[PDB]
Ligand binder design. Sequence first.
Ligand SMILES: OC[C@H]1O[C@H](O[C@@H]2[C@H](O)[C@@H](O[C@@H]3[C@@H](O[C@H]4[C@@H](O)[C@H](O)[C@@H](CO)O[C@@H]4O)O[C@H](CO)[C@@H](O)[C@@H]3O)O[C@H](CO)[C@H]2O)[C@H](O)[C@@H](O)[C@@H]1O
Ligand SMILES: [Ca+2]
Length: 250
Amino acid sequence: DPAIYFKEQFLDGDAWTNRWVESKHKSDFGKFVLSSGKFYGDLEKDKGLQTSQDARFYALSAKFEPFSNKGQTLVVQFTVKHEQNIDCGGGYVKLFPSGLDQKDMHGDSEYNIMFGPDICGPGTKKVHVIFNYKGKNVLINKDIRSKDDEFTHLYTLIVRPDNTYEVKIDNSQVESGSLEDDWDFPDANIYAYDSFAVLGLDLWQVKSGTIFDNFLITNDEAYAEEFGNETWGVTKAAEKQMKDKQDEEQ
Ligand SMILES: OC[C@H]1O[C@H](O[C@@H]2[C@H](O)[C@@H](O[C@@H]3[C@@H](O[C@H]4[C@@H](O)[C@H](O)[C@@H](CO)O[C@@H]4O)O[C@H](CO)[C@@H](O)[C@@H]3O)O[C@H](CO)[C@H]2O)[C@H](O)[C@@H](O)[C@@H]1O
Ligand SMILES: [Ca+2]
């Protein structure tokens, strides 16, 4: 049986607010709203969290029963849709250990892993993969290109107990190697963390309108691939046809 540590598909309406916490660290964080956007694969299935305010910081997080990846695989996966045609704005997640105050979470709150696309003008169009190791946040030595169009894309990070990793975009490998070689941190336990307890969205955006959906944290690579195909894989073609429709009808 795959261990599902966390899963969020926003399938139950306004009830998501019972599972996600707004940080109060700042008084003027932008608001996340539940939305399937202007075009979608399915009105209900493609409901996710959308940034609703221009030129704001965002800080929202969801807790889950704490776990450790010691001795097993860790997979983190979600969809990002920059439906607005984004100029500058984050689309990554952070994983936090136990002890985070969700009501006070912010950009400098200490995290274990940060992963996902970041866009900031043409000069920043990169997928971050950051490991906190011995008091330092270490950025991956590799250039992974992020998606910049208006459509929904799947982002997957896989971390293995043999100190290997893989990054997938749209369920397809884009980068692969070992933690020893692709970060400037030999330690057999680089991969492992004593606890994960919270998934956070800590973002700055200029033009807002990005939608996040289909969050998954699991110990099973095969299950993540399947879940990805059943979520993003299903959204992909349907949403393209409805975008094609809207252009032709205009
Ligand atoms: O990028 C690695 C870094 O990520 C996390 O920290 C993020 C940064 O603190 C910051 O992200 C930057 C922000 O840049 C802009 C704005 O804040 C600047 O004042 C302005 C002037 O130069 O430029 C931008 O408008 O947002 C962009 C777009 O996402 C980012 O690319 C920049 O990196 O803010 C975000 C949100 O709070 C932080 O997540 C990690 O915490 C950190 O450890 C890591 O080194
Ligand atoms: Ca959804």
